[PDB]
Amino acid sequence: EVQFLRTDDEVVLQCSATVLKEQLKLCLAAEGFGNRLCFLEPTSNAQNVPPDLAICCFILEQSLSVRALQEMLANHRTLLYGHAILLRHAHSRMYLSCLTTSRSMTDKLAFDVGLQEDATGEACWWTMHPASKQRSEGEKVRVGDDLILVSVSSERYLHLSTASGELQVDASFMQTLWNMNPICSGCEEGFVTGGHVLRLFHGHMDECLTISPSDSDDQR
Amino acid sequence: NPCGGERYLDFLRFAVFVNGESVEENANVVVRLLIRKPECFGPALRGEG
Amino acid sequence: VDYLLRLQESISDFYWYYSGKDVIEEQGKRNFSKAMSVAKQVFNSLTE
Amino acid sequence: AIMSFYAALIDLLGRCAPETHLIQAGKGEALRIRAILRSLVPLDDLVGI
């Protein structure tokens, strides 16, 4: 059976761009602390240069229907097309939202996309829609599907802007197809998994593998 | 085609605005459809250029 | 089955609409009765 | 014709604008629609026209 995305799953929002007649895969990323705006980390050249995947991981905290979201705002579940999802940055724990500020010189109607400290408001919620009619509203979102995200607050698609030389992500009225590639679904207790930060101890010697202190003469 | 655009905009105005007050349902639907099809706003309001 | 799924989604949406309100008015009750009668007929069809 | 089309479009959007009583009641849909209209039409452009 095809894998179905579920809440509490780490995912990376991925888009494809053609630069110099070459397909380039980019993942939505954000630092969170010191920079709330989202950029795009290329991942096609992974064999030669590792991507900074630490900041590209988002957790599907919660998925709701539109009416349920309206009621909740007024006051594991499989993702279904048409529902509203709440993406929380794994590192900073700030929620992906459609910012009111805009810095896109090319597009006047576009808005910046960035992280938000709190989940309050309708800016943090995004609605998934099928990219093609092969899927229909109410169908479970299969892993590897192409979907378009529409901001609830601004009614703007999550867009890849190639107008300028740089590739940038913004909320505009032009739609971009996004792939929600799973990173992890559920880790059984006590087992190591990729993307975990850990210390490598020398057996049980209490010795750990480490680089030299800061300002060392070996340049660390 | 500004002339046809104006005619259809006039019809949409009559559809949304009634007796000096806006009809909320029709206004919301019309706004959503217009934003979904940005070319309705005309070349000037088109975002990219 | 597809029509039943559509009807279930509509009923769930309508429940979400009325969840906040303390009491369902007569029009809401009537729409509930119509939707649930249609759902009962569909369930009987599947059973047969 | 171009000016007539743009005037008709702005008129239609203004009509689609939510009502003041809804805005005071703070209805989410009304505030969202007003924000969308404000984003579409800058105030400086209206003042200059």
Amino acid letter, residue B46? R
d(CA B48, CA C9): 38
> By the 8 A CB rule, do B1 and B42 touch?
no
d(CA A11, CA A98): 18
SS (H, E, C) A121-174: CCCCEEEEEECCCCCCCCCECECCCEEEEEECCCCCEEEEECCCCCCEEEEECC
CA-based radius of gyration for chain D: 12
Q: Give φ, ψ of A120 to 5 degrees.
A: -65, 150
- Cβ of D25 under 8 Å from any chain B Cβ? no
> By the 8 A CB rule, do A39 and A56 touch?
no
Burial D14-33 (b: 16+ CB within 10 A, else e): ebbbbeeebeeeebeebbbb
d(CA A142, CA A37): 28
The secondary structure of A163-204 as a DSSP string is: SSSS-EEEEESS---EEEEEEES-PPTT---TT-----BSTT
> By the 8 A CB rule, do A62 and A79 touch?
no
Strands A58-64 and A146-151: unpaired
d(CA A94, CA A92): 5
Q: Where are the alpha helices (DSSP H) in A39-85?
A: 66-74
Measured between alpha carbons, how far is residue A19 from residues A25, A41, A44, A179 in Å? 10, 14, 12, 19
Cβ-nearest to A65 among C6, C12, C20: C12
Query: Chain-centre distance of CA A186, in angstroms?
Result: 18
> By the 8 A CB rule, do A182 and A193 touch?
no
d(CA A46, CA A50): 5
N-terminal to C-terminal alpha carbon distance within chain A:
48
> By the 8 A CB rule, do A52 and A29 touch?
yes
> By the 8 A CB rule, do A171 and A1 touch?
no
Q: Please enumerate residues of A whose Cβ is less than 8 A from a Cβ of D.
A: 70, 73-74, 109, 111, 122, 153-155
Interchain pair B27, D29: CB under 8 A: no
> By the 8 A CB rule, do A82 and A65 touch?
yes
Amino acid letter, residue A32? G
Sign of CA dihedral B22, B23, B28, B31: negative
> By the 8 A CB rule, do B15 and D16 touch?
no
Neighbouring CB atoms inside 10 A of A153's CB total 22
Amino acid letter, residue A182? P
d(CA A42, CA A26): 4
Amino acid letter, residue A191? F
Q: Give φ, ψ of A147 to 5 degrees.
A: -135, 155
Q: Which tokens go with A220?
A: 């660390």
d(CA A46, CA A44): 5
d(CA A138, CA A129): 10
Q: How many CB pairs under 8 A join B and D?
A: 67
> By the 8 A CB rule, do D32 and A153 touch?
yes
d(CA A133, CA C36): 30
D 1-49 residues inside an 8 A Cβ radius of A: 28, 32, 35-36, 39-40
Q: Which tokens go with A119?
A: 């989940």
Q: Which tokens go with C27?
A: 């029009």
Interchain pair B42, D19: CB under 8 A: no
Count H helices, E strands: chain C? Answer: 2, 0
Q: C9 a known binding residue?
A: no
The secondary structure of A64-76 as a DSSP string is: E-HHHHHHHHH--
